[PDB]
């Protein structure tokens, strides 16, 4: 039939996909929160001797330095991936630039104003 019902079907698909993306993102956020809570070792900061407290804090600082190094490495890797995918997008545009520029739609002059002027209030859609 016409594209009105087909357009309705397409918009329904778009809404369903958006709902699924939002749901998946929320699930990812919850899973990430739980996983992060799992990763970091809980604190045990009671009843510890003063020197024992200092030694434990030093151990925590050493582990913090280790995690800093690891996460800096991961950050550098992700930065390299970002740069490489930016280059890939550049190549994508190179293979898809040229004549593939969408154009605006302004060829139609104002028509509602003329209809109202020449017919009074008989044009109510716009």
């Amino acid at each position: 039939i016409s594209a009105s019902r087909k357009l309705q079907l397409k918009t329904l698909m778009l809404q369903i996909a958006k709902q699924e993306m939002e749901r998946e993102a929320e699930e990812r956020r919850g899973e990430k929160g739980r996983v992060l809570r799992t990763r970091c070792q809980p604190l045990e900061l009671d009843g510890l001797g003063f020197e024992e407290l200092q030694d434990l804090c030093r151990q925590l600082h050493a582990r913090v330095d280790k995690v800093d190094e690891e996460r800096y490495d991961v950050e550098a890797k992700v930065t390299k991936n970002i740069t490489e995918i930016a280059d890939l997008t550049q190549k994508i545009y190179d293979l898809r630039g040229k004549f593939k520029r969408p154009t605006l739609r302004r060829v139609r002059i104002s028509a509602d104003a003329m209809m109202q002027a020449l017919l009074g209030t008989r044009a109510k859609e716009s």
């Binding site: 990812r28 990430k32 992060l36 030093r58 890939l88 898809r96």
Partner: protein, 74 residues
Amino acid sequence: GKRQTEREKKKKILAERRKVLAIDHLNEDQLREKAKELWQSIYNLEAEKFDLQEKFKQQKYEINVLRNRINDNQ
């Protein structure tokens, strides 16, 4: 000095993400507070690493998509 820049940046991060720490002149409460600072910093680093993992997954997927599109374009 690009590789030297990366090495020095990393070494600074060692002395930057971890400043000069002296746990000897601090009372028990201060030691507990600093230890929790370290703990929460590590937790934040874990969060950032997880974000990086997600971003890397997206980057891989989009890179594959771009490869497919490039192959199609020819």
